[PDB]
Design a protein around this ligand. Structure first.
Ligand SMILES: Cc1cc(NCc2cccc(CN3C[C@H](O)[C@@H](O)[C@H](O)[C@H]3CO)c2)cc(-c2ncccn2)c1
Length: 765
């Protein structure tokens, strides 16, 4: 039955608009296969189209906003794009139609409406670009009847091992096609849909924009060569209409020019499914997916007071749709330094200089190929997998569709190497590398990131203990399915736990350090004078200078998270010996968090270091790090340490702002200094952990029940309202929020863990 559910999940999830790095395109979850993408741009002159055309996602003054209004990767969804530069409001509807043996069929409608500011006779070029990778596969445009291009539909017929036979149609569409009365029309036609079928080596087909422009440029070269000149030039839109030449190839460019509003469909029909997809099917399936989305949302994300109103529901649907709509499929090689230089051990004072020296040996090389199916922090800025971000992304996604979340977890763990390492940033293949400066591509096997994916597993385990609709929860509704899943995953979880302990160990025995356990101490590798990128809290202040004798309280807390998960999952699988080992480890961390990290004088937890005099010293910087044992759920509900942390949490002169908890205290010497990334601003992910833990204390008997209820109530409201107000005003989720003004700042379209807000509103943790 586990095999059966797996096969049905595979077929269900195979197709999607899984290219979030671009405004709109599709690909299946197969490395070398068929991929599509859309481009559009107004043309008002002979030189503007290169500057107006749109393809890869960005966010700047010429784009009002864009994103998914509704989305479910099993069914499809609807995206809206509001383009100021091109004067257009665009909708892309995508829908999936199950059937056959190759992951089913799909369709999309592309609709463009000029906004109020645009000239009513604006000319817009639209291109649908199709490529197919694979040694043996084939794809051919059926030639038109007409002399110069197509009066009606463009049909591509293709075949591959992965997809079997299929056809992909770009419909005639609706809207005015401009017509040229120029002499050129005798040789190029007066204006019509055109197709060019080309071939390039497979590894460059992703380069759609250069490939398109190389063809446009050759068309212009032809004009010049054939005496079309400035004494009597064709209109710009005709200069930029490709000469029709359909045929066979691994690239097909389908181009249309519209005057005023327009729309057209893309119909992909899997031959193994029988009857082909029509436009009427598209319209029916789009209607049905919306109805299903609405019903699931009201069940899964039932927003509680004071967020029950229609305005907050629309807000929630947007934040959620943008999060799950960010899911991509990525495939290719990644850049990794496999030297294991000894400098990377960081065992000496001044280690960051030695590690820099090793990095300058540039031993990294491409390896793989790897694949990844994952949600992402940001379409325009960070369109790829980030390890600790993904644990937060999956908490709302697991609510919606636990089977999908487990699929993504499995994808990530399938990257793990023989030692237990998963690179914290997954830049897979040339297309992915194209967005990233070369200096930032290389991944390092000694660099960790918080194991937040364990949080998602925790929720799954709790559900486990306590047709698309059926598949979405199959792994919990069938207990033996969920548990076979855990059985396969458990060894990888254990390997990663061992890896943290092997590679991120701190030093107790070499110094005058007294503690209950001589084993439990942790130090994040990879720190520089001003940063600790691997912790996730880039510029949060740490001991200065960095030192091989540092101990980081957040990392120790994350180890505690992992050991608790392993206790839960080990128990289910009957791993008796393992559980005894984990039990002793947890006891040890509970004691050592106190012995090595608790500051009585400051009333919170602190990182530690070793003095100029080789003595243990606490380094207290009150902020998120100070709260880590509470955030990760390691403190008992009656702990006096807890009570002091609640005082710090609620203190307006420290962490509490009207807009959420500040990352760093206003009273800290580093508040609002340098780049100020994690040195004051409000971050939704850590606020989310605080909210969930406050709620935990609030709904249990104990000394702090009432304090926690009060802080829970207010922090929920502060956080939700901050993200809501900014969204109302700007259309965006932001990376972080200003604690003085409440304004979203840093990057836009951060969905992204800011989307946790949907689950804070729905409550009932
Ligand atoms: C070449 C380059 C380097 C950097 N360096 C910082 C950086 C790199 C990757 C991702 C993030 C975002 N997040 C930082 C969070 O602190 C972390 O916790 C979290 O996992 C991570 C993922 O969301 C920041 C930033 C840019 C940039 N590009 C466009 C707009 C603004 N900046 C460009």
């Amino acid at each position: 039955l586990h095999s059966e559910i797996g096969r049905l999940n595979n077929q269900s999830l195979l197709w999607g608009p899984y290219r979030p790095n671009i405004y709109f395109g599709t690909r299946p979850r197969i490395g070398k296969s068929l991929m599509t993408g859309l481009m559009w741009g107004k043309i008002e002159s002979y030189t503007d189209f290169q500057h107006t055309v749109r393809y890869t996602c960005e966010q700047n003054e010429g784009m009002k906003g864009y994103g998914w209004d509704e989305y479910d990767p099993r069914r499809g969804g609807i995206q809206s794009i509001h383009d100021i530069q091109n004067g257009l409001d665009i909708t892309t509807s995508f829908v999936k139609i199950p059937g056959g043996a190759h992951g089913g069929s799909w369709a999309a409608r592309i609709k463009g409406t000029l906004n109020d500011d645009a000239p009513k006779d604006q000319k817009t070029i639209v291109v649908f670009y199709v490529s197919q990778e694979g040694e043996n596969s084939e794809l051919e445009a059926v030639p038109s009847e007409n002399e110069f291009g197509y009066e009606g539909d463009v049909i591509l017929k293709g075949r591959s091992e992965a997809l079997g036979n299929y056809k992909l149609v770009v419909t005639k569409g609706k809207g005015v096609i401009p017509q040229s009365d120029h002499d050129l029309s005798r040789l190029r036609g007066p204006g019509q849909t055109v197709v060019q079928s080309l071939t390039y080596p497979d590894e460059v087909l992703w380069q759609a924009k250069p490939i398109l422009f190389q063809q446009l440029k050759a068309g212009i070269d032809w004009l010049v060569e054939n005496k079309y000149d400035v004494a009597d030039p064709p209109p710009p839109w005709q200069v930029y209409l490709l000469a029709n030449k359909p045929g066979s190839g691994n690239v097909h460019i389908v181009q249309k020019v519209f005057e005023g509003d327009f729309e057209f469909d893309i119909l992909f029909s899997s031959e193994s499914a029988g009857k082909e997809v029509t436009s009427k099917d598209l319209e029916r399936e789009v209607k049905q997916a919306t109805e299903v989305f609405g019903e699931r949302f009201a069940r899964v994300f039932d927003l509680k007071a004071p967020f029950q109103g229609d305005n907050y529901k629309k807000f929630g649907k947007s934040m959620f749709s943008n999060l799950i709509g960010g899911i991509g499929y990525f495939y290719g090689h990644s850049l990794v330094d496999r030297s294991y230089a000894p400098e990377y051990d960081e065992e000496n004072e001044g280690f960051w200089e030695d590690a820099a020296e090793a990095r300058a040996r540039h031993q990294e090389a491409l390896e793989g190929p790897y694949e990844l199916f994952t949600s992402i922090p940001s379409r325009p800025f960070f369109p790829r997998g980030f390890l600790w971000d993904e644990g937060f992304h999956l908490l709302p996604i697991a609510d919606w569709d636990i089977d999908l979340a487990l699929e993504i977890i499995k994808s990530w763990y399938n990257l793990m190497d023989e030692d237990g390492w998963i690179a914290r940033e997954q830049i897979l293949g040339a297309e992915a590398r194209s967005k990233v400066p070369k200096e930032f591509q290389t991944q390092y096997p000694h660099y960790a990131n918080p194991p937040t994916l364990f949080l998602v597993l925790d929720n799954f385990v709790e559900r486990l203990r306590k047709l698309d609709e059926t598949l979405s929860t199959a792994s919990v509704d069938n207990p033996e399915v969920g548990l076979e899943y855990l059985r396969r995953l458990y060894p990888l979880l254990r390997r990663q736990f061992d890896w943290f302990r092997k590679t991120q160990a701190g030093d107790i025995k070499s110094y005058d350090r007294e503690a209950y356990s001589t084993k439990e101490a942790y130090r994040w590798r990879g720190r520089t004078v001003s940063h600790c990128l691997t912790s996730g809290l880039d510029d949060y202040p740490r001991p200065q200078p960095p030192h091989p004798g540092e101990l980081h309280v957040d990392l120790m807390s994350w180890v505690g998270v992992m050991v608790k998960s392993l206790i839960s999952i080990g128990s289910l699988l009957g791993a008796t010996e393992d559980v005894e080992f984990y039990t002793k480890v947890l006891d040890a961390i509970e004691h050592n968090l106190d012995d090595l990290h608790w500051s009585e004088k400051e009333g919170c937890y602190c990182d530690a270091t070793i003095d100029e005099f080789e003595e243990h010293k606490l380094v207290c910087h009150k902020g998120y790090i100070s709260l880590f044992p509470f955030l990760t759920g390691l403190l008992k509900p009656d702990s006096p340490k807890l009570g002091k942390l609640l005082a710090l949490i609620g203190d307006e002169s420290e962490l509490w702002s009207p807009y959420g908890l500040r990352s760093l205290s206003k009273k800290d010497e580093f508040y609002g200094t340098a780049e100020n990334y994690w040195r004051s601003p409000v971050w939704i992910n850590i606020n989310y952990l605080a909210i969930v833990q406050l709620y935990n204390i609030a709904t249990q008997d104990g000394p702090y029940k009432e304090t926690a209820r009060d802080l829970y109530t207010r922090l929920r409201k502060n956080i939700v309202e901050t993200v809501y107000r900014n969204w109302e005003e700007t259309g965006f989720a932001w990376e972080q929020y200003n604690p003085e003004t409440g304004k979203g700042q840093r990057t836009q379209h951060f969905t992204g863990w800011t989307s946790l807000v949907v689950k804070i509103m729905s409550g009932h943790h």
